Write a protein that binds this ligand. Structure first.
Ligand SMILES: O=C(O)CCC(=O)C(=O)O
Ligand SMILES: [Cl-]
Ligand SMILES: [Fe+2]
Length: 296
């Protein structure tokens, strides 16, 4: 230590900038302070990062235990733990998967044991149409009308990858019903409390997303009409295709930036493909000292 400096946005404004961070030399106190910033400011942007794929993984390992993506076509060829979103061919070859995350979601929300921190290391940044949209679903919960808070009290939600599972090269010539069934076997829908208590901050988090949350059910386990989910999406800003909604944050980045964010509190999505500019990003996803919530 002696050089990492964290500049948190004032008050309730989301985000922080971190200058002079070196994952190879940061002290234990440095890491703890960076973690506190991630949990409270939700998005920390590390500046001046010039890392190999291996050094990026080592940075992630300072924050938690990396987990590799369960579908391997997403994995970096040299680092299994790096998830690659890319539509720029490397020597004419497809690396990772193109055009990922074009829907509101929290990462691994369709899995039974989601990780708490996401790291994104942009490699190729669109000049004009850059950035990722975010919603703080704890702040979004607090801003719901009281009666809507009451209506979801005690409910559970079902989360599934079934809408956005991407066809793989080895799926060609298979009947689609067989892939549909395989997805339900490998990644069955996961039931979670509709809201949970953030282990690091104590905030109530509304843990739903338009992309992965496929149903809501009552305290007795009986399915509820999906209009309730639609009203929740609407109220939290997830149905606003203009992205002007008050809850929505557009996070931009520049070369050398590295985004680290709270994957309990936030949902995110890619921008509309308004321009043909390409996107390449490397992702590391790490488990921290607590489960997503105490009920996991
Ligand atoms: O499209 C997917 O499979 C999800 C990708 C993702 O998590 C992201 O692009 O932020
Ligand atoms: Cl994910
Ligand atoms: Fe994502």
């Amino acid at each position: 230590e002696g050089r990492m400096q964290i500049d948190e946005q004032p008050g309730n404004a989301i985000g922080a900038a971190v200058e002079g961070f070196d994952h190879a030399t940061a002290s234990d106190a440095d890491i703890d302070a960076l973690k506190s910033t991630i949990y409270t400011k939700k998005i920390a942007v590390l500046k001046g990062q010039d890392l190999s794929p291996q050094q990026f993984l080592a940075l992630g390992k300072r924050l938690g235990r990396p987990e590799a993506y369960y579908e391997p076509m997403y994995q970096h060829p040299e680092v299994t733990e790096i998830f690659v979103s890319s539509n720029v061919p490397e020597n004419g070859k497809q690396i990772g998967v193109p055009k990922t995350g074009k829907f509101w979601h929290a990462d691994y929300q369709f899995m039974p044991d989601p990780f708490g921190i996401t790291l994104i290391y942009p490699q190729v940044i669109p000049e004009k149409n850059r950035g990722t949209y975010f919603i703080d679903m704890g702040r979004a919960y607090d801003r719901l009308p009281e009666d809507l808070k009451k209506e979801i009290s005690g409910t559970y939600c079902r989360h599934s990858v079934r809408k956005y599972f991407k066809i793989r090269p080895h799926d060609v010539y298979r009947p689609i019903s067989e892939i549909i069934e395989e997805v339900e076997r490998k990644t069955p829908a996961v039931v979670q409390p509709t809201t949970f208590t953030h282990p690091m901050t104590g905030e109530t988090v509304l843990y739903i997303s338009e992309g992965f949350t496929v149903g809501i059910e009552d305290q007795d386990g009986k399915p509820l009409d999906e209009e309730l989910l639609k009203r929740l999406f609407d109220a939290t800003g997830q149905l606003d295709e203009s992205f002007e909604h008050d809850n929505i944050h557009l996070q931009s980045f520049e070369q050398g930036d590295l985004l680290v964010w709270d994957n309990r509190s936030l949902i995110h999505r890619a921008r509309h493909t308004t321009t043909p500019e390409p996107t390449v990003s490397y992702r590391v996803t790490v488990h921290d000292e607590r489960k997503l919530h105490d009920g996991i």
